[PDB]
Design a protein around this motif. Structure first.
Motif, mmCIF file in Angstrom:
data_model
loop_
_atom_site.group_PDB
_atom_site.id
_atom_site.type_symbol
_atom_site.label_atom_id
_atom_site.label_comp_id
_atom_site.label_asym_id
_atom_site.label_seq_id
_atom_site.Cartn_x
_atom_site.Cartn_y
_atom_site.Cartn_z
ATOM 1 N N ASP A 155 0.868 -1.205 -0.095
ATOM 2 C CA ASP A 155 0.016 -0.029 0.123
ATOM 3 C C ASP A 155 0.826 1.175 0.024
ATOM 4 O O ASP A 155 2.094 1.277 0.061
ATOM 5 N N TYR B 284 0.262 -6.207 1.479
ATOM 6 C CA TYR B 284 -1.322 -6.752 1.660
ATOM 7 C C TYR B 284 -1.426 -7.670 0.310
ATOM 8 O O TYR B 284 -0.345 -8.110 -0.485
ATOM 9 N N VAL C 23 -3.761 -9.683 -2.649
ATOM 10 C CA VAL C 23 -4.841 -9.427 -3.833
ATOM 11 C C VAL C 23 -5.455 -10.758 -4.121
ATOM 12 O O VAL C 23 -4.422 -11.475 -4.771
ATOM 13 N N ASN C 24 -6.663 -11.042 -3.870
ATOM 14 C CA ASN C 24 -7.278 -12.364 -4.472
ATOM 15 C C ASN C 24 -7.913 -12.243 -5.616
ATOM 16 O O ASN C 24 -8.868 -11.881 -5.731
ATOM 17 N N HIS C 25 -7.314 -12.576 -6.672
ATOM 18 C CA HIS C 25 -7.801 -12.489 -8.032
ATOM 19 C C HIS C 25 -8.772 -13.419 -8.393
ATOM 20 O O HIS C 25 -9.495 -13.437 -9.472
ATOM 21 N N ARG D 116 -11.812 -11.509 -6.356
ATOM 22 C CA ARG D 116 -11.869 -9.992 -6.424
ATOM 23 C C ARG D 116 -11.829 -9.248 -5.058
ATOM 24 O O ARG D 116 -12.833 -8.560 -5.005
ATOM 25 N N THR E 101 -9.419 -8.114 -1.188
ATOM 26 C CA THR E 101 -8.016 -7.951 -0.820
ATOM 27 C C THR E 101 -8.246 -8.094 0.728
ATOM 28 O O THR E 101 -9.243 -8.161 1.356
ATOM 29 N N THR E 102 -7.027 -8.395 1.360
ATOM 30 C CA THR E 102 -6.816 -8.568 2.751
ATOM 31 C C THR E 102 -5.470 -8.553 3.245
ATOM 32 O O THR E 102 -4.412 -8.241 2.398
ATOM 33 N N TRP E 103 -5.282 -7.996 4.714
ATOM 34 C CA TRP E 103 -4.061 -8.064 5.184
ATOM 35 C C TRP E 103 -3.547 -9.364 5.311
ATOM 36 O O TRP E 103 -2.364 -9.391 5.462
ATOM 37 N N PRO F 174 -6.941 -2.613 3.880
ATOM 38 C CA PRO F 174 -6.110 -2.654 2.842
ATOM 39 C C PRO F 174 -6.747 -1.839 1.632
ATOM 40 O O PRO F 174 -7.958 -1.618 1.631
ATOM 41 N N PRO F 175 -5.742 -1.486 0.708
ATOM 42 C CA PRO F 175 -6.324 -0.941 -0.627
ATOM 43 C C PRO F 175 -7.505 -1.982 -1.391
ATOM 44 O O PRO F 175 -7.336 -3.007 -1.045
ATOM 45 N N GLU F 176 -8.269 -1.274 -1.891
ATOM 46 C CA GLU F 176 -9.483 -2.157 -2.585
ATOM 47 C C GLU F 176 -8.822 -3.102 -3.902
ATOM 48 O O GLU F 176 -7.832 -2.679 -4.469
ATOM 49 N N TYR F 177 -9.597 -3.797 -4.083
ATOM 50 C CA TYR F 177 -9.356 -4.709 -5.336
ATOM 51 C C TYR F 177 -9.560 -3.759 -6.807
ATOM 52 O O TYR F 177 -10.458 -2.811 -6.520
ATOM 53 N N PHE G 234 -10.928 -2.517 -9.628
ATOM 54 C CA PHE G 234 -12.119 -3.251 -10.404
ATOM 55 C C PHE G 234 -11.928 -3.148 -11.782
ATOM 56 O O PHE G 234 -12.311 -4.071 -12.565
ATOM 57 N N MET H 179 -10.726 -6.374 -13.501
ATOM 58 C CA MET H 179 -11.687 -7.476 -13.906
ATOM 59 C C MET H 179 -12.050 -7.522 -15.333
ATOM 60 O O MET H 179 -12.775 -8.374 -15.543
#
Lengths: 33, 11
Positions: free
Chosen positions: A11, A17, A19-21, A24, A26-28, B3-6, B8, B11
């Motif tokens: 960040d 952090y 990113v779950n692609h 869609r 995100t998480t720590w 955290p920062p957002e996905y 978008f 996509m």
């Protein structure tokens, strides 16, 4: 490294952090499997 | 805070 579909990013404060692609989101929290 | 957002547009 990370499970399929997941990406590690940083960040604006340099904090890691994840990113779950697949779903869609995100998480720590680093994924375990 | 969260955290920062996905990203978008990605996509």
């Amino acid at each position: 490294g990370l499970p399929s579909g997941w990406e590690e990013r940083k960040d604006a404060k340099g904090r890691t952090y994840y990113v779950n692609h697949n779903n869609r989101t995100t998480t720590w929290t680093r994924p375990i499997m | 805070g969260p955290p920062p957002e996905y990203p978008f547009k990605g996509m």
